[PDB]
Amino acid sequence: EDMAKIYGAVAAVSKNVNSSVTYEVKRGTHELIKVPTIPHNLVLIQSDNGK
Amino acid sequence: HALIKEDLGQWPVETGISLVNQAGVFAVQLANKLGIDKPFVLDAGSNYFT
């Protein structure tokens, strides 16, 4: 029974090793909006007689 | 066809960690299965017939 206690304690230490890590790479990334219409700024001004 | 098989059980083994440390845990369980964990003397002399 004492040996079973000792062996189990050593096994727990051996299981404390770390396998790897995982993370998400997202810094520097932004979302894009979509502009539907082209912003023209032209207006036509004409005289009443059409001259 | 006939075969003789010795059944000592199945013991899970984990990779990535020391096998010797795992074998220590299973050795005690195996000893209990065979009945040799505690001090003993065999008394099989009288198990016979003529």
TrEMBL record, chain A:
Superkingdom field: Viruses
Name recorded for this polypeptide: Vp2
Organism: Banna virus
Lineage: Viruses, Riboviria, Orthornavirae, Duplornaviricota, Resentoviricetes
First and last residues shown, out of full length: 152 to 202 of 955
Automatic annotation (TrEMBL), chain B:
Domain of life: Viruses
Protein name stated in the entry: Vp2
Portion of the parent chain present: 203 to 252 of 955
